[PDB]
C-alpha cells in the first residue's frame, strides 16, 4: 500500500532537502515507543525472555533489544 | 531561435495521397516530439497526435488512425505528416509543433493547409457592377466587384492598383462546383462616381490573369 | 472521456473592461492543468495561461485566471484591440488530450446599421447565361443580421450565397455580402429584386429594391 | 552560473603538469580551479535539463464508486452473473448472500450473488520515463577577471568580458568549446548520458507537482494503475471495498483520495519543477576541462600609482577565503591592482594566495569598482591592498588552522566518497596508477557487496552494523578483521552521514 | 579512397544491438563523395588511439549526392568510450559506456 513502502531513500546523489527528512528519523522509534507505551504489560515480560537463555550475560540483552523492535507492527 | 516552418498550402484531389512536411529550428531535431493538431473546416482545432521522435514512433489520436501517418527526417530537422486515401472532408489547415511533453509546447508550426477538390484550374469572372438608384445612400454611391469561379487561391482584388483603399472591403469565397466566388465593394463618395475612375484590379496569379473592370453608370 | 465548453462563445466588451470567463472541466479534479489559447481566424493560436496562474514567454501580463477540478477562469481585466481574437482552453491529467468549444473577444461600439446596397447582374455575367445578385451590407454591428432576398415580394432562398467578414480591424464592424444567383432566363422572367436586411439596429428591415423595368 | 556566494563552494589546488583534467560537478556544489598560468575558474550546474518525456503509465490513486449493482440469486445455483462483467468499466465480484424462507429464497444458509460498480476516477497520477539523449545539462562556466558586485553575479555583463559561458552538453554533442575572449579558450568534454542513470529511475506526477521516483519501486506501487493509451486499468478494485450482503442490499464504498499516501510513499524524493523543460535540482555529470588554450595576458601591466578605497568592507566566505570590492580612484588605470596577503606589516613578503589572480583595473575611469577575492593564511594575517603611502590594510584571522583542515580533508573525503559511488575517485583527477586502482577496487566493490545488500534504509543497514560490530568482538586470531570487514566504514559511515 | 572533408549527420540516434556492439546511422552532407567515411571507437577525446573495432570494415559514401544515409556498426570496448565520426573540427562525436 502507499502507507508503507516508501520511496525512502534515493540515496543517489541527492544532497538537498527531500520530501520529508527530518520526519524520517521519527518513522519506526515513535510509532514503536508508541506500541510499547501501549503494550507495558508486554514489556515487563519482554525482556525477561532475554535473560531465561544462553547465559552468556551481554548478547542477552542482544535478544531483548531486538526483540523488543520487533512486536510492534511486527 | 526556435520556429517550426512547414509544407505551404496543397492542392489535392479525392483519392490521392500527401506526405505533410514540419521543418523545424532552434533546436535538435530528436529531442522534441511532434505535436499534429488538425483545424477542421468549422474552425474546431482537432489533435492529431504526437510522434515520438527518438525512435521515431507515432502515437496517433484514434479517430486519425491508419488514414494518416508520422514519419521523420533526422539530419535536416524536418518531421514529416503523411496521409493515405485523400478526402475532401480533409480540407483544413494542419499544424506541428517542438514538444514540452504534458504541458504541450512553446512554439507553433506554421501550419499547412490541405485543399482536397475536384476542379479545373481556372480564371474568375469578374463583372464590374453598376449601382442603381437605391444603391445611393447618404452622399456616397457604393461599388462592387463580383469575382465569381476562380480556382485555386488567392486572388487580389484592389481597386484603382490600390490607390483607394477606403471603402473597400474584400470578402471571402467559399465553394461552388470547388470554385471560389467572392466580391469586393469599394465605397467612395457620390462626388467622385462616375466623375472619378473606379476600376477593380483582381490580381489571380494562381490563373496568370489580372482583370481590370471599371464600373459605368446606368 | 472530459468534455469541455467556454462561455460566453461571444463577449462584447470595450476595452480596459474586465472579462472573466465562465468555464468547466467534466471529468473532475484536473487539479490546476488548464490552459488558455487566443486564435485569430486563419492563424494558430498562442499559449495564454500555463499552472493557471502563469503566462508564457511571449503573452503579456494582461492574461490572468484561476481555478482547479471542475471550473477554471481566464480573467483579463484590461482587455485590448490586440487582445481580438477566438479563445480556447485545452486539458491535460487524463487522455485523450482535448479542448473546450471556443469564446470570442468583441470590442464593444455603438450598435451601427448596415449600408446595404444590391447590384444588378452585370451585362458580362447576364451574356454568360447566368445572373448573380449582388447584396452588399458594410459597417453594421452586432454581428446580428439576417438577409431576405424578395423577388417580387415573394422570398427566394434557393442561389442566395452569403459572405461576410469578421470584426473590422479599423472601426470594428461586421460587414457583410449576399448573392442571389440565378439563370438570365429565370433572372429576365422575375421584376422585382430587393434585399431586406433586418438588423437590432433598424427595427424594421432595410429594403434596397431595383427592377429590371426600372432604368 | 559563477562561485559566488554559493551554499557549497569547493575549490581545485593545480598541479600543472597536464592542460586537461576530468572532473565532476552538481548543481548546488560551484568548483573553483587556481592554476598556473590560468586564471581562477568557476564551474558549476544549474540545473540538469531533459528535453522529450515519454509516458510509461499512470496511477489513479483517488475514485468513487458508481452505479451499485447486485444480482442476487438461490443457493445451489453456483456462480451468479451479472450483465454488467462485460464491459471493463463495471467493477464486478461474486459473494454471496445468506438465504431464509423470508428473503428471496427456499433455501437457507448460503446463496449467490454478483455485485457490480462502474468504476470512476476523481484522481489520477502520471509517471515519466527518461531518454538518455534528451537528458540536457546547463553548465555555468565562469572565470575570474576584473569584477564587481554586480557584474559578478551578473551573466550577461561577464558575456560581454567574455568571462563567463553557458552551454547544453547532450550525448549527441557531449563535447563543448567555447572561449573566454582575451584569456584564451577552453574545451569541455562532458559526459551527458553517463552523469545520472537515465534508466534506473522514473518521474511520477502527483497533483500538479511532479516527483522522482525509482522506477523499479515505480511498477511496485500498489495502487490502480493506468495503460498509456486510454481505458482498461488493473487493480481498481483496491480502492473501493465490499460489505454484508443483506438481501439484494451490498454498498461498495471507494477509498479517499491516496494523494497525501503519495507524499506519505515519497520519503527521499526531489522536489521537481518544469515548463517547457524539466530543470533538476542536484547534479551529476563528468566533464573534462582542457585548459590549454586558457592563458595569462597582461601581467606586462605595472602596478597602480594611487589610493585605493573599499566598495564594500571585507568578510569571509565561510569557504577558507576572504573576498573584498574595491574602488580604485586613480586615473593611472588601466593598471595591475597591488595587492597581498601578509603575515606582519613588517613583513612585505606575500603569504597568503589571490583567489583572484592578476586584479586589473578595467579602463581608467576614476572610483572604478573592483571586486577580487584572496586566500589569506591560518593565523593573525593581514589584507594589504597597495605599496608605499599609497596602501590601506586591514586585519584577519582565520581559526580553521590545518589540523580541523586535514579532518575536514578526510572526513568530508568519506563524505565525497559516499553517495559519489565510483565516481568518487574522479576529485583524483590526472590520475592513473593509485587514483585509476582506487576507483577500480571500489568498482567491483561498487559493483557488489553495498549494492547488493543496498536498499537498506537508515537504521535498517546502521543498526545491523552495530551488531555487525560484534561479529568483531567473537573471532579468531588472523580471521579477525574478516567478520569486521564490511563492518566498519561503507556501512555505519552513511548511517552517521546521514542523522537526519 | 581517403578521408572525407565534410560535416556529418546522424540520420537515427546511436544504440545498443544488445548483442555486444553498436550500430549508427549516418547522413552525410558532404559533396566531396564517393570516399571513405572517417570513423573511430576511442576510450577518451584527449586520446585519439581506435580502441573499439568497426562491425563494418571500411565505411564508404555510395554516391557524390549530399545528405546520403549511411548505415555502420561498430564495436566500442568495455567501459566509457566515444563514438567519433569524422576527423579534425568536422567531427560530431557520442558517448558510450558498456557494462558487459
Known amino acids: 500500500s502507499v502507507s508503507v513502502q516508501t520511496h525512502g531513500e534515493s540515496s543517489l546523489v541527492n544532497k538537498t532537502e527531500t520530501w520529508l527528512d527530518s520526519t524520517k528519523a521519527t518513522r519506526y522509534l515513535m510509532k514503536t515507543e508508541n506500541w510499547i507505551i501501549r503494550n507495558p504489560g508486554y514489556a515487563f515480560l519482554a525482556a525477561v525472555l532475554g535473560w531465561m537463555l544462553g547465559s552468556n550475560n551481554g548478547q542477552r540483552v542482544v535478544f531483548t533489544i531486538l526483540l523488543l523492535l520487533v512486536a510492534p507492527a511486527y | 531561435q526556435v520556429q517550426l516552418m512547414e509544407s505551404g498550402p496543397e492542392l489535392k484531389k479525392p483519392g490521392e495521397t500527401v506526405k505533410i512536411s514540419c521543418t523545424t529550428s532552434?533546436?535538435?531535431?530528436?529531442?522534441?516530439?511532434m505535436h499534429w493538431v488538425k483545424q477542421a473546416p468549422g474552425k474546431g482545432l482537432e489533435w492529431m497526435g504526437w510522434?515520438?521522435?527518438?525512435?521515431?514512433?507515432?502515437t496517433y489520436a484514434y479517430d486519425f488512425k491508419e488514414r494518416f501517418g508520422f514519419s521523420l527526417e533526422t539530419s535536416a530537422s524536418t518531421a514529416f505528416l503523411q496521409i493515405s486515401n485523400l478526402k475532401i472532408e480533409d480540407t483544413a489547415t494542419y499544424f506541428c509543433?517542438?514538444?514540452?511533453?504534458?504541458?504541450?509546447?512553446?512554439?507553433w508550426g506554421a501550419g499547412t493547409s490541405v485543399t482536397v477538390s475536384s476542379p479545373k484550374t481556372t480564371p474568375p469572372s469578374v463583372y464590374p457592377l453598376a449601382p442603381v438608384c437605391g444603391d445611393t445612400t447618404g452622399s456616397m454611391v457604393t461599388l462592387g466587384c463580383l469575382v465569381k469561379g476562380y480556382f485555386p487561391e488567392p486572388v487580389t482584388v484592389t481597386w484603382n492598383s490600390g490607390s483607394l483603399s477606403s471603402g473597400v472591403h474584400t470578402f471571402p469565397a467559399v465553394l461552388q462546383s470547388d470554385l471560389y466566388t467572392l466580391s469586393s465593394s469599394v465605397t467612395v463618395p457620390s462626388s467622385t462616381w462616375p466623375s472619378e475612375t473606379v476600376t477593380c484590379n483582381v490580381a489571380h496569379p494562381a490563373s496568370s490573369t489580372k482583370v481590370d473592370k471599371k464600373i459605368v453608370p446606368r | 472521456d472530459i468534455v469541455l465548453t467556454q462561455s460566453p462563445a461571444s463577449l462584447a466588451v470595450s476595452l480596459g473592461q474586465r472579462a472573466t470567463i465562465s468555464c468547466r472541466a467534466s471529468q473532475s479534479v484536473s487539479t490546476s492543468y488548464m490552459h488558455w489559447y487566443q486564435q485569430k481566424p486563419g492563424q494558430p493560436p498562442r499559449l495564454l495561461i500555463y499552472l493557471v496562474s502563469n503566462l508564457e514567454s511571449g503573452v503579456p501580463s494582461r492574461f490572468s485566471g484561476s481555478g482547479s477540478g471542475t471550473d477554471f477562469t481566464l480573467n483579463i481585466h484590461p482587455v485590448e484591440a490586440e487582445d481580438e481574437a477566438t479563445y480556447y482552453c485545452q486539458h491535460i491529467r487524463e487522455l485523450t488530450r482535448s479542448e473546450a468549444g471556443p469564446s470570442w473577444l468583441e470590442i464593444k461600439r455603438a450598435d451601427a446599421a448596415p449600408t446595404v446596397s444590391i447590384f444588378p447582374p452585370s451585362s458580362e455575367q447576364l451574356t454568360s447565361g447566368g445572373a448573380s445578385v449582388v447584396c452588399f451590407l458594410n459597417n453594421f454591428y452586432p454581428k446580428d443580421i439576417n438577409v431576405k432576398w424578395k423577388i417580387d415580394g415573394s422570398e427566394r432562398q434557393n442561389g442566395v450565397l452569403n459572405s461576410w467578414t469578421d470584426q473590422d480591424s479599423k472601426d470594428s464592424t461586421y460587414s457583410m455580402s449576399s448573392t442571389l444567383t440565378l439563370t438570365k432566363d429565370e433572372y429576365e422572367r422575375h421584376n422585382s429584386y430587393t434585399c431586406e436586411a433586418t438588423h437590432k439596429t433598424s427595427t424594421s428591415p432595410i429594403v434596397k429594391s431595383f427592377n429590371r423595368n426600372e432604368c | 552560473f559563477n562561485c559566488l556566494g554559493m551554499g557549497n563552494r569547493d575549490f581545485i589546488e593545480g598541479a600543472s603538469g597536464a592542460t586537461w583534467v576530468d572532473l565532476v560537478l552538481e548543481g548546488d556544489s560551484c568548483l573553483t580551479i587556481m592554476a598556473n598560468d590560468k586564471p581562477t575558474l568557476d564551474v558549476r550546474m544549474i540545473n540538469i535539463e531533459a528535453s522529450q518525456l515519454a509516458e510509461v503509465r499512470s496511477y489513479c490513486y483517488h475514485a468513487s464508486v458508481t452505479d451499485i449493482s447486485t444480482v442476487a440469486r438461490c443457493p445451489m445455483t453456483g456462480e451468479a452473473h451479472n450483465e454488467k462483467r462485460a464491459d471493463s468499466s463495471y467493477v464486478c465480484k461474486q459473494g454471496f448472500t445468506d438465504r431464509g424462507w423470508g428473503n428471496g429464497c427456499g433455501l437457507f444458509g448460503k446463496g449467490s450473488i454478483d455485485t457490480c460498480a462502474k468504476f470512476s476516477c476523481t484522481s489520477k497520477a502520471i509517471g515519466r520515463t527518461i531518454q538518455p539523449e534528451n537528458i540536457k545539462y546547463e553548465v555555468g562556466i565562469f572565470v575570474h577577471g576584473t569584477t564587481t558586485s554586480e557584474n559578478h553575479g551578473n551573466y550577461s555583463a561577464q558575456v560581454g568580458a567574455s568571462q563567463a559561458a553557458k552551454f547544453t552538453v547532450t550525448p549527441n554533442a557531449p563535447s563543448i568549446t567555447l572561449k573566454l575572449g582575451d584569456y584564451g579558450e577552453v574545451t569541455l568534454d562532458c559526459e551527458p548520458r553517463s552523469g545520472l542513470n537515465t534508466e534506473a529511475f522514473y518521474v511520477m506526477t502527483v497533483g500538479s507537482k511532479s516527483f522522482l521516483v525509482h522506477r523499479e519501486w515505480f511498477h511496485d506501487l500498489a495502487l490502480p494503475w493506468t495503460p498509456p493509451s486510454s481505458t482498461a486499468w488493473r487493480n481498481r478494485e483496491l480502492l473501493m471495498e465490499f460489505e454484508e450482503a443483506h438481501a439484494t442490499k451490498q454498498s461498495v464504498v471507494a477509498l479517499g483520495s491516496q494523494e497525501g499516501g503519495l507524499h506519505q510513499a515519497l520519503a527521499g524524493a526531489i522536489v521537481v519543477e518544469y515548463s517547457s523543460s524539466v530543470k533538476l535540482t542536484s547534479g551529476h555529470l563528468k566533464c573534462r576541462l582542457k585548459m590549454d588554450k586558457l592563458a595569462l595576458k597582461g601581467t606586462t601591466y605595472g602596478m597602480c600609482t594611487g589610493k585605493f578605497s573599499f566598495a564594500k568592507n571585507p568578510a569571509d566566505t565561510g569557504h577558507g577565503t576572504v573576498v573584498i570590492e574595491l574602488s580604485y580612484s586613480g586615473s593611472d588605470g588601466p593598471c595591475k591592482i597591488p595587492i597581498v596577503s601578509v603575515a606582519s606589516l613588517n613583513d612585505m613578503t606575500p603569504v597568503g594566495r589571490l583567489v583572484t589572480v592578476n586584479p586589473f583595473v578595467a579602463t581608467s575611469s576614476a572610483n572604478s569598482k573592483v571586486l577580487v577575492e584572496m586566500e589569506p593564511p591560518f593565523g593573525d594575517s593581514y589584507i594589504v591592498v597597495g605599496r608605499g603611502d599609497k596602501q590601506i590594510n586591514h586585519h584577519w584571522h582565520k581559526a580553521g588552522s590545518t589540523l580541523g583542515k586535514a579532518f575536514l580533508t578526510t572526513l568530508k573525503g568519506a563524505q565525497r566518497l559516499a553517495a559519489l559511488g565510483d565516481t568518487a575517485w574522479d576529485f583524483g583527477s590526472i590520475g592513473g596508477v593509485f587514483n585509476s586502482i582506487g576507483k577500480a577496487v571500489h568498482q567491483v566493490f561498487g559493483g557488489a557487496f553495498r549494492t547488493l545488500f543496498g536498499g537498506m534504509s537508515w537504521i535498517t543497514q546502521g543498526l545491523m552494523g552495530a551488531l555487525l560490530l560484534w561479529m568483531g568482538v567473537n573471532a579468531r586470531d588472523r580471521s579477525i578483521a574478516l567478520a569486521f570487514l564490511a563492518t566498519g566504514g561503507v556501512l555505519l559511515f552513511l548511517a552517521t552521514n546521514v542523522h537526519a | 579512397y581517403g578521408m572525407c572533408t565534410g560535416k556529418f549527420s546522424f540520420a537515427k540516434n546511436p544504440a545498443d544491438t544488445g548483442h555486444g556492439t553498436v550500430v549508427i546511422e549516418l547522413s552525410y552532407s558532404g559533396s566531396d563523395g564517393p570516399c571513405k567515411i572517417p570513423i573511430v571507437s576511442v576510450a577518451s577525446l584527449n586520446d585519439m588511439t581506435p580502441v573499439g573495432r568497426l562491425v563494418t570494415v571500411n565505411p564508404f559514401v555510395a554516391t557524390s549526392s549530399a545528405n546520403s544515409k549511411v548505415l555502420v556498426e561498430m564495436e566500442p570496448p568495455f567501459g566509457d568510450s566515444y563514438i567519433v565520426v569524422g576527423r579534425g573540427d568536422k567531427q560530431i562525436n557520442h558517448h558510450w559506456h558498456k557494462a558487459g
Open positions: 509543433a517542438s514538444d514540452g511533453r504534458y504541458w504541450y509546447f512553446g512554439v
Open positions: 510522434i515520438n521522435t527518438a525512435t521515431g514512433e507515432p
Open positions: 532552434g533546436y535538435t531535431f530528436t529531442d522534441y516530439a
